[PDB]
Amino acid sequence: PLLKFDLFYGRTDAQIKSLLDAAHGAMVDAFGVPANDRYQTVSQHRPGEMVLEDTGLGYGRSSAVVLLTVISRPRSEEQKVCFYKLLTGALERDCGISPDDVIVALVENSDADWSFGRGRAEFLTGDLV
Amino acid sequence: PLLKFDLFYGRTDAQIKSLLDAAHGAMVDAFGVPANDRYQTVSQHRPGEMVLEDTGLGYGRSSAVVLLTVISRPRSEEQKVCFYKLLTGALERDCGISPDDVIVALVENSDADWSFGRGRAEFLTGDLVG
Amino acid sequence: PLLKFDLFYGRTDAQIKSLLDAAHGAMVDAFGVPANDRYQTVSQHRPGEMVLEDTGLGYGRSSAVVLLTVISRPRSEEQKVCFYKLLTGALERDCGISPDDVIVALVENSDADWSFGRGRAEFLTGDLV
């Protein structure tokens, strides 16, 4: 899958690396993909450049808030439910990020919708499962 | 929904907030979601960093151009048609942005595909409707 | 379609433009859309801000690596397969980018999901095929 993170400026590069490693671990745990199925980008924003409310749910947001968009081949409802919990558990334990600071949106594509290198469609050719 | 804006550098932060407010109002009006269902990011680009033409339609593009990507649960074709008109109307009235300077693309997902906080799937648990 | 590029800092704006032009050519060739169906953004990243592995496929990633995300109406499987090959073909020939440095993810939407200008839905009104 591809994980795209949107955060506010303010973290060191070490704290960004911790957040990416903790999130990658949770993704691998929840989806059962290979450990080297790692594709992640980080976009840093100034305070004027993200607005993230809570739909009245009573969360909890600070400048450490992490918005994660995920593009993935289909996953079961349970895999998704598990990933959210695994992700906030790892971000709390390993990065000190409050679960109230984590927002996730997933979008689905299919086998033909990926090319990992060399102009190849590796799910189609069977190079990948 | 999640609303991601791509614009060129040049606006003050007040003018950015005005754009974000106007778009959010249009979205709430078109789609009927709660007023605090607000999730917006902005990425600012140098001239070398966005190219946005017109598919030969005859628009209109200036440095003020706004590309908006939306991720949303399913909406009717009517609601989308309505949103595009509400959005340009609001951006023109509230921000002075020409309707020729507004480009939108929407992507759909489903109930299971959202977690708003605490590792919860609120559309699934019924915390949100739904 | 909308082509969103994520790259590391390092290229001149001429090098960026040559990347965008090559990719646009490939997409026009593979999908048969009008030449002025051109909608592209670029986000530049510091070394800390993208991690792109290979899922054990044996690629080849340098600081020149390009991650492209495409939003498009539906395309046949063959068209997507052709696009990936045409893309790396052009990026190598015109930009000097190794095919091991090209990663593509596509996401699909429908006619009702686009508004190119003036609050119009051009695929719905028939202004556009």
UniProtKB/TrEMBL annotation, chain B:
<dbReference type="InterPro" id="IPR014347">
    <property type="entry name" value="Tautomerase/MIF_sf"/>
</dbReference>
<dbReference type="InterPro" id="IPR037479">
    <property type="entry name" value="Tauto_MSAD"/>
</dbReference>
<protein>
    <submittedName>
        <fullName>Malonate semialdehyde decarboxylase</fullName>
    </submittedName>
</protein>
<dbReference type="Pfam" id="PF14552">
    <property type="entry name" value="Tautomerase_2"/>
</dbReference>
